Amino acid sequence: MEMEKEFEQIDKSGSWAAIYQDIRHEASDFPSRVAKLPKNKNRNRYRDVSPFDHSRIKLHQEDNDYINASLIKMEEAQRSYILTQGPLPNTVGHFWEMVWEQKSRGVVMLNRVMEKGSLKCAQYWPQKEEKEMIFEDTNLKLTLISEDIKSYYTVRQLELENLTTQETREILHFHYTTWPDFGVPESPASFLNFLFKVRESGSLSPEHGPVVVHCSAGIGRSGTFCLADTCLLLMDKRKDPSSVDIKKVLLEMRKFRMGLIQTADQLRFSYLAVIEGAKFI
Ligand SMILES: Nc1nnc(-c2ccc(O)cc2)s1
């Protein structure tokens, strides 16, 4: 069923809350035993948001390999994403270790450091060229190279250095700065513009490790970003773009991380973004 018609049918009937609960009811349930170990309690931002054991990212160290991060592997679309939480004061070194080990080119950030008067994630990148950051626990150095500030997003060039080998890599930081404190954006136009800027960079392409995507919990806004991207790629691989079922794509993605899309308003916004983006695809 053409999703644009399914959309008007749900909207006219006001059944967004009913569709969303059906998804929550059918979603996969897999163990997260490593996330709930007592040694990991200070590695988790939210008690109710954990990575499944089968899909979790492992840090390459014998001490403790745990980070709140999942590999979402979309087989038909041929795209992979790492979804993670906003880093904590004691996990900023783990975060950059993961970026290094997984060979990521891009980091996508969909939140502000402060929202609703509370801290949603650590200040995990340098704000001035001449004041670099050193992570002593993971032996990494991070330098701000340049910054391009626009109306809806900021793009930063960073240099990450493995102090152990003196190898360096260029990381691009794509920071969407205008998602509102409550609700979802009114138009998907600036979110779609942002997504196509990330694509243009090469960050989502198979010659690199998976893109790292985060918000505060790494399931709501982060879920919207990967669902829209995968749906638009599929609408292009299929003889009948109309065969793309956004609810079936979301349940597939929920096999890899729990809770993707946190509200009925985020589900509706995801439909809007894909409907509007398809008009350019
Ligand atoms: N009426 C139409 N159905 N499909 C179209 C299409 C699909 C993929 C593209 O890359 C460009 C155009 S137009």
3-state secondary structure 40-107: HHHHCCCCCCCCCCCCEEECCCCCCCEEEEEEEEECCCCEEEEEECCCCCCCHHHHHHHHHHHCECEE
CA proximity to 203, closest of 175, 178, 172, 240: 172
Is 262 assigned a ligand-binding role in the annotation? yes
The dihedral built from the CA positions of residue 189, 191, 194 and 195, taken in this order, carries a sign that is negative
Q: Which residues pair with 157 in a beta bridge?
A: 146, 172
Closest CA to 112 of 175, 183, 191: 175
Q: What angle do CA 183, 184, 189 make, to 5 degrees?
A: 160
| Ligand 1 geometric centre to CA of 184 (Å) | 29
Q: Is 217 annotated as a binding residue?
A: yes
Q: Answer left, alpha or beta for residue 132, where phi above 0 means left and psi between -120 and 50 means alpha.
A: beta
What's the chain look like in SS3?
CCHHHHHHHHHHHCCHHHHHHHHHHHCCCCCCCCCCCHHHHHHCCCCCCCCCCCCEEECCCCCCCEEEEEEEEECCCCEEEEEECCCCCCCHHHHHHHHHHHCECEEEECCCCEECCEECCCCCCCCCCCCCEEECCCCEEEEEEEEEECCCEEEEEEEEEECCCCEEEEEEEEEECCCCCCCCCCCCHHHHHHHHHHHHCCCCCCCCECEEEECCCCCCHHHHHHHHHHHHHHHHHCCCHHHCCHHHHHHHHCCCCCCCCCCHHHHHHHHHHHHHHHCCC
Ligand 1 atom closest to the Cα of residue 236 is 8
- Alpha carbon separation from 18 to 8, 15, 24, 231 (Å, rounded): 15, 5, 10, 22
- Which one-letter amino acid corresponds to residue 97? E
Beta bridge partners of 222: none
Decide: 26 in ligand 1 pocket, CB within 6 A. no
Q: What technique was this entry resolved by?
A: X-ray
Distance CA 201, CA 192 (A): 14
CA nearest neighbour of 21 among 264, 199, 281: 264
CA of 280 to the centre of ligand 1 (A): 9
Tell whether ligand 1 has an atom less than 6 A from the beta carbon of residue 2. no
Domain boundaries, the chain: 1-281
- What is the whole-number distance in angstroms between the Cα of residue 225 and the centre of ligand 1? 22
Find the 281 Cα to ligand 1 centroid distance in Å: 7
Give the C-alpha separation, 266 to 187, whole Å.
12
* Tokens 């243009």 -> residue: 200
| Atom 7 of ligand 1: nearest residue by CA position | 236
Pocket mutation for ligand 1, best pick of 232, 236, 239 (most atoms within 8 Å of C-beta): 236
Which residue's CA is minimally distant from atom 12 of ligand 1? 281
For 89, the token pair is 């004061």
Q: Distance from CA of residue 135 to its chain's centroid? A: 23
157 is known to lie in a ligand binding site:
no
CA atoms within 13 A on the CB side of 68: 29
What would you measure as the largest C-alpha separation in the chain, in angstroms?
60
User: Is 215 annotated as ligand-binding?
Assistant: yes
| Residues assigned a catalytic role | 215
CB of 236 within 6 A of ligand 1: the answer is: yes
Q: Return the closest-CA partner of residue 230 out of 217, 215, 211.
A: 211
Distance 243 CA to ligand 1 centre (A): 13
Is 17 annotated for ligand binding? no
| CA–CA dist 121, 212 (Å, integer) | 15
Q: Hey, whose CA ends up nearest to atom 11 of ligand 1? A: 281
* Residue whose CA is at the smallest distance from ligand 1 atom 4: 241
Query: How far lies 98's CA from each of 53, 56, 198, 231, 281, in Å?
Result: 17, 12, 20, 27, 32
First vs last C-alpha separation in the chain? 19
Of residues 230, 270, 256, 265, the one with CA closest to residue 27: 256
